[model samples]
Each structure stands twice: as structure tokens, then as C-alpha cells.
Target: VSDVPRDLEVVAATPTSLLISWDAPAVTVRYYRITYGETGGNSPVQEFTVPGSKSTATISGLKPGVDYTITVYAVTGRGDSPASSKPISINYRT
Candidate 1:
């Protein structure tokens, strides 16, 4: 096992969009999974899977003033790397 994904950083967030970035394990990463939802829920209202080693993504279609929790995971042929980075809390600015 590896260390829990750490150093979650929020680049930009607004009422309808969010720009997020993070660093992953120092190894080959195949894809990334981003999950986010309202503050009090365990299930994400939106989930996105991005392929390749990109470190940033833009998420849209969100309501303003809503607090959301986000988490990112790194995936590979071996299996998903133990959830790359910790959950980040952000509220879309209206």
C-alpha cells in the first residue's frame, strides 16, 4: 500500500465551474477519477474520469453556493493507486 493521497489543491472554483490540480505518486499513472458531491453526502453528485497523465481538469454544471467535497484517484493496469490525494472541500462562488 502507499500513502493516502495528499496535497490536494484547488486552483479555481466558481458557481458553474471548477479547476482542480494535484500531484500523484512518482510513477506511471494511466488515468484519474474525480468525485465530488454536496457537503453532507458520501456519494458524489458528479464523477469524472480523465485518461492520461494530465494534472488538471475543469468541472462544470454545478450549482452556486453549494459546498462540495472532492477526491481524486490514480488508475493503472495494475489497479487504481490508493486514491491519489485527499478530499478537497470547496464551495462554488455564486
Candidate 2:
């Protein structure tokens, strides 16, 4: 069984970036992935991967004054775990 990342939080933010952190899964994973998209808009989704042991990531290339939803997944040889539940919400700083 797979477990989702938890306790997702926005550790920091800038006009065009966000620093996020979360709790890793109980089981070992190959890596972690984060997906983000502008909420209520048509901007293309963005994503990046983190090493399995890492708990923090900074995402850049985002638009200012826009709100986005971010989801985290634990990845293993089997596949990605279910995304964190409506994991995070933040308005990119203007």
C-alpha cells in the first residue's frame, strides 16, 4: 500500500515562487512529486520531483497575484500515491 505525503505547508513565498515542505510517507519511496496549477484559470500545470529523502522544495516560474493549488505525491516503483487531499492553497505574492 502507498501513503500520501502529509502536513503540506507553504514555508515561504515570493512574487514568482513558493517554498513548500511536507511529511514523508511511512514506507520508503523512490521520490516525491509536486503538481501545481493556477486555480480557476487555464494556465498549464507545472511540476517537479524531489529525492525520496528530501522534505522541502521551491517551485519557481509562477505568476504573481495568482492563486494556485498544490498537491504532493509519494512515488515508488509501483506508482504514485494518491495526492494529498486538496493539499495547499496560496496566492502568489504581488
Candidate 3:
């Protein structure tokens, strides 16, 4: 099985929220897992999962003026796909 993502991109990032998008291969993807943490040696404060070939996700409840790193993974009955893209870092002050 291939875990490669077809297209991965970040749509928006802000202090209170973030939006991400990605496309999977022809194979079916059951869900998407999002993990995020504060930048500079901070543990992840939040994590969420979305079900069904979802191509977009909006993450909320973040601290202002803090840098966060986010990563996305595709999950299926077989298993979780390799990480979709590299970690994205963003600083939100609003």
C-alpha cells in the first residue's frame, strides 16, 4: 500500500484557527489525524481526528502569539498512511 498524498497544502493559519487541505490517492482514506504543538520545545496541546475522505480541516483553540507546528496523517482500515506533508510552523497573534 502507498501512503503518499497527492496534494497537500495549508489554506490558512491564525492565532485561533488553522485550515489544511490534502488529496489522497485512488485508494480510500478513512480519516485524517491532525497533531499540533507549540513551537520551541513545547508539547502538543491539541489533537483531533476527522473521518471519511475529508480533504479539509479547521483547527481551533490556540494561544495568541504562539508558534505552532502541525502535521497531518491519513488513516485507513489497513493503517495510517505516512505523514501527508512536512510539519508546518505558524505564529498567530490574532
Candidate 4:
């Protein structure tokens, strides 16, 4: 389907935790993959896969004074959607 996860956003943030949320797409999604880490060319990657029906998640175990990049994609039987990511860079203890 052409639809992808939308409005991926950082609802709340702390030194070691992040609260993330997103909106569902037009098509039916069976699963979702949330990818994140210190923003770079692909050095650090932390992935969390969740049920497609859910729209919120929390990520913990982070260090202070670091920036992170986050993105999400919707998955179906056919394939996955293009990533939908927040436009701003996230930093903790910066």
C-alpha cells in the first residue's frame, strides 16, 4: 500500500527515556518497526518492533548528553512502507 506511518513524534523525553507516538496509515498494517539511536551514518541502531494497532512506545536505557534519530515504518504482508521520521533532531542532556 501507499500509506505509511504518519505523524511520528516525540511526545515526551528524559535523560534516559523517550515517549514516542505515531498515527496509523490508510492501509492495514500488521506490524511496525521503530528504529532509533545516536544520529549518524548508521553506526548506532536500536530497533523496536510492535503491533501495528499500537501507536505509542517508550524507549529507555539511554545515556545523557547524546542526540538520537528516530523513524518508523508500517509493515504488511506485501512489504513495508517508507520510513516516517520526525524532522527535528533529539538530544538529551545537551
Candidate 5:
């Protein structure tokens, strides 16, 4: 089993990338699965993984001036933790 990450933060790092960070739970996590997509519409969802050794990651090739919903999940040997709290929405760099 796993726990949801805490204090998820999303920042527009560039026109094509976003910087995301979070606080891990007490339990040991293998890595984090980050899923995101442009809010609404038909933009395909995108995701990436971050090693448990790190608490942050940068997702690139994003569309600027668009709102995206980001979610982080703590994954252990058991499996991914339940989805994190309400996903955070932010506009990408314009």
C-alpha cells in the first residue's frame, strides 16, 4: 500500500515545461507517477515517473497558455496509492 503525496505544487517553468514538486508520506515509496492533461477538451493525457529519491520533476512538451490538472501518486511494491487529493489546476507558461 501507499499514501498520497502532500503539498503538490505546479509551476510553469517555460513555454514547454512545468515544474512540479511534492512532499512524500511516512511510508517508503518506490517512485511517483505523475499524470496530467490540459483541463477539459480533447487534449491527450500525459504522465511521467519520478524516482522516490527525488521529490520533484519537470514535465516538458506542454502547450502554453493552457490550464492543466496535475496529480501525483505514491507507488510502492504494493501498487500506486489512492489518487491524491483534488488535482491542482494551473495555467502553463504563455
Candidate 6:
């Protein structure tokens, strides 16, 4: 009923937050659900919603130099998409 999101990316990172973006299909979708947390842990102690109107999103309140596993879901009038794609893992440290 839904397609997996594409090109999920960590566009930027800082000591307190991470920026994420993804490509959406041309069809209508309600919004996006972002679930993230520490790698190898009961992740997703938090969640964020991206309005269908936007392609990019920014998030904060993060741990420095910590690896986090991130996943995106597409929501539509039909229903919530599966864990659309393989979760992307990232950390903020340069």
C-alpha cells in the first residue's frame, strides 16, 4: 500500500542535533515518521513528524559522538508504511 522512502540522509550534524532528509514519491502522502535512538539500544526514545509538504527535517537534543540508528516511515490515507527502508546509522563528530 506504500513505498519505501528513498535516499534517507543525514545532511548535517552538530553537538546537540542532527539534520535528516529523504525523497518522497510524487503521489500523496500524509507525513513522515522519524524514529531514532542510540545504536544497539532500545532506540526511538523519541520521534519526529515531517509534514507531507516538506522533504527535509531537522532534529535536536542529541548526544555528542554517539551513534544513532534512524528509520523513516511514510504515512498516507491508506496506512503507515513498513519500516520503509533499512535504518541509517550516523554520529555527530568531525
Which candidate should be chosen as best, given lDDT against the real structure?
6
Off by over 4 Å in 4: 41-45, 78-94
Give the root-mean-square deviation of each candidate in angstroms. 4.6, 4.6, 4.9, 5.0, 4.5, 4.3
lDDT of 1 by residue, 1-94 (tens): 4434555677877767877776655565567788777777766688878774676777887676666666566664456546444444444323
Candidate 4, 66: how far from true, in Å?
2.4
Clashing pairs in 1: 5-85
lDDT of 5 by residue, 1-94 (tens): 2365567666546766767777766665667677777767586577777667787776677676667666566666544655343333444433
Q: What digit string (tens of lDDT, one per residue) describes model 2 on residues 33-92?
A: 778887676765788787768777777887766666765666655456553432444444
Per-model lDDT: 0.64, 0.66, 0.63, 0.64, 0.63, 0.67
Which wins on lDDT, candidate 4 or candidate 5? 4
What C-alpha lDDT does candidate 1 achieve relative to the native structure? 0.64
CA error at residue 28 for candidate 5, angstroms: 1.6
Model 2 reaches what TM-score against the true structure? 0.67
Report the backbone clash tally of model 6: 0
Query: Worst 10-residue stretch by lDDT in candidate 3?
Result: 85-94
Inter-residue clash pairs, candidate 3: none
After TM-score superposition, what is the CA distance of residue 66 in candidate 6 from its true location, in Å? 1.8
- lDDT value for model 6: 0.67
For residue 10, give model 3's deviation from the true position in Å: 2.4
Across residues 18-43, which tens digit of lDDT does each residue of candidate 3 receive? 67777654566667677777766645
Residue 86's C-alpha lDDT in candidate 1? 41
TM-score of each: 0.64, 0.67, 0.61, 0.66, 0.65, 0.69
- Which scores higher on lDDT, 4 or 6? 6
**Model 3 deviation from native, Cα RMSD in Å:** 4.9
lDDT of 6 by residue, 1-94 (tens): 3355667666887777777777776766667677777766754568878676788887887777666677666665555544343334444332
Judging by lDDT, tell me the better candidate of 1 and 5: 1
Q: Count of backbone clashes for each model?
A: 1, 0, 0, 0, 0, 0
